Every structure is written in structure tokens, then in C-alpha cells.
Amino acid sequence: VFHKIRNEDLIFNESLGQGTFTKIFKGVRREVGDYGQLHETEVLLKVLDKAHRNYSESFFEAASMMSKLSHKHLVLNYGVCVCGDENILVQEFVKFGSLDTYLKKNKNCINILWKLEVAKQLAAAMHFLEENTLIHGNVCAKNILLIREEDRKTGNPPFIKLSDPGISITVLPKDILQERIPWVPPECIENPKNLNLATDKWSFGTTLWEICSGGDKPLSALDSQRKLQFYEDRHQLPAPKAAELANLINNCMDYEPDHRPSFRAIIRDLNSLF
Numbered sequence: 001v002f003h004k005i006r007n008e009d010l011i012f013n014e015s016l017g018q019g020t021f022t023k024i025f026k027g028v029r030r031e032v033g034d035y036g037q038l039h040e041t042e043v044l045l046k047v048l049d050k051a052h053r054n055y056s057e058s059f060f061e062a063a064s065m066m067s068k069l070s071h072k073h074l075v076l077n078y079g080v081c082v083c084g085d086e087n088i089l090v091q092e093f094v095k096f097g098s099l100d101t102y103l104k105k106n107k108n109c110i111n112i113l114w115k116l117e118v119a120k121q122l123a124a125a126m127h128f129l130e131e132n133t134l135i136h137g138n139v140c141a142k143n144i145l146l147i148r149e150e151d152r153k154t155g156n157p158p159f160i161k162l163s164d165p166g167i168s169i170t171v172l173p174k175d176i177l178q179e180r181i182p183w184v185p186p187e188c189i190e191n192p193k194n195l196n197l198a199t200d201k202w203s204f205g206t207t208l209w210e211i212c213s214g215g216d217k218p219l220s221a222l223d224s225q226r227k228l229q230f231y232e233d234r235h236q237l238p239a240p241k242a243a244e245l246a247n248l249i250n251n252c253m254d255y256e257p258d259h260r261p262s263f264r265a266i267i268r269d270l271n272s273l274f
């Protein structure tokens with residue numbers, strides 16, 4: 001499992017946000033680096049809520065997966081802080097935060113080139129998970145982290161990474177399973193044991209919607225009840241103004257899991273644009 005990192009070396013700084021039953025902070029780690037050097041490294045500290053500690057098994061196994069593989073688009077895990085009454089994951093601090101809020105805050109300066117480049121990097125990471133027969137389970141723009149911006153003054157591209165899935169939808173309560181419509185695929189609302197590789201093909205389609213909709217949240221005007229009726233009337237998401245990917249979004253968000261294209265195919269289609 002995890003490298004154990006002592007409390008004496010971690011220093012909690014500013015709240016950066018929250019996830020599902022989790023508090024997320026910028027931090028500082030003291031450590032001996034390469035050549036016996038001493039570093040004080042910026043980290044990310046993710047605390048499992050005090051009330052929801054019973055979820056700690058899924059909370060840590062979800063991070064356990066990312067640390068079992070190694071790929072340039074997967075977020076690095078440094079270890080777990082050892083306190084006592086706490087569950088703290090220490091992870092790679094990414095300077096530019098969530099694609100989620102980056103898209104909102106930059107909604108007007110994103111040409112479909114920048115979008116397409118980020119989608120290719122995301123499919124690459126999802127294709128690597130697919131060949132390893134490994135389920136993520138929570139592909140959403142808020143689980144995507146921006147290592148590097150475009151540098152509009154050179155021709156460099158952005159570079160993103162993919163973070164933890166967090167607590168499994170296997171165990172979360174149903175009210176929590178139903179606001180993440182349309183990220184949770186329709187079979188998993190039926191019963192979360194429908195979790196399969198095919199889950200990520202649906203959710204990737206929803207993230208593709210988010211990336212094109214300047215950070216709107218799909219179906220944000222609907223409450224839970226209506227979100228369920230969205231799936232029972234088997235509707236689709238509307239096509240974004242930026243519409244070049246509306247077909248790919250729909251092919252990915254297929255109501256039959258066995259028909260969702262492989263990420264091999266998703267990449268090829270994604271590459272066939274000018």
C-alpha cells in the first residue's frame with residue numbers, strides 16, 4: 001500500500017475546495033529529495049470528512065488504484081499522512097486546479113483546438129485504463145487537473161492529468177448517486193453493480209459536453225427526481241454551440257453499454273478532425 005509520511009513534515013495551508021465527503025487543501029511537505037537534498041514541496045492534502053469516516057475503505061482504495069499504475073496523465077500519490085483520527089491522502093499539487101473552474105473562468109478564450117487537444121489527452125488516459133482492464137468510475141471535468149496552460153505566445157499545448165475517482169459509487173448513497181446525473185450512466189442508477197469498463201465511456205461523453213459547454217453543468221436546472229425522469233425518457237444531452245463533438249458525445253453516451261465505442265475508436269474519430 002502507501003508510503004507512510006509523518007505529521008511533523010506536513011503543513012496545512014489554504015482550503016482549495018471539496019469533493020464528495022472530503023476537504024481539499026494546499027500544503028507543504030518537508031522531505032529529503034534526490035542527493036539527500038532537503039526540499040519543502042508543495043502538496044495536496046485530501047481529508048475524508050469526520051462524519052463520513054466509515055467510507056474510509058473506498059476512499060483509500062480509489063487512490064490505491066492510481067498509485068498501482070504509472071502514466072503521464074495520471075495524478076501522482078505521495079502517501080498517506082499519519083495522524084490518528086484522520087484519513088489524509090497526500091498527492092501531487094497541480095498549479096492550475098480543476099479544468100472545471102478553468103473552463104468557467106476561461107469560457108470565452110477556448111477555441112475548439114484547445115478543447116480537442118485536452119480531449120485527446122483525456123482519451124489517452126482512458127485508453128490506458130482500458131488496456132489495463134481498470135475502471136475509473138468518475139470521469140468529470142472537476143477530476144481533471146491542469147498541469148500547464150497553453151502558452152499562447154508559443155505554440156505549446158495544455159497538459160492535463162486525471163485525479164482519483166474518490167469514494168466508489170458502489171457504496172455512496174442514492175441521493176448522492178442521483179445529482180451526478182448525467183455523469184453516472186443509466187445502468188448504475190438501476191443498481192451500482194452494473195459498474196463496468198463501459199461506465200467510463202458514458203462519463204467521458206459527459207465530460208466532453210462540459211469541455212465544450214464552457215463549464216456549464218449538464219442538466220443543472222433539474223432536481224434529482226427530474227434527473228431520473230431524464231433517463232427513463234431516455235433523452236440525450238443537447239448539442240453544444242461548439243457542436244463539432246456532439247456526435248461523439250452521443251455515441252459515447254449510448255444507453256446500451258455494449259455499444260459504446262472503445263477508447264481506441266474514440267481516439268481515431270477524435271483525430272479525424274482537421
Ligand SMILES: O=C(Nc1c[nH]nc1-c1nc2cc(CN3CCOCC3)ccc2[nH]1)NC1CC1
Pocket residue numbers: 016017019024044091092093094095096097098142143144145163164
Ligand atoms: O480537486 C482536486 N484538486 C487538486 C489536485 N491536485 N492539485 C489540485 C488543485 N490545485 C489548485 C490550485 C488552485 C489555485 N489556482 C487559482 C487560480 O488559478 C487556478 C487555480 C486552486 C485549486 C486547486 N486544486 N483534486 C481531486 C479531483 C478532486
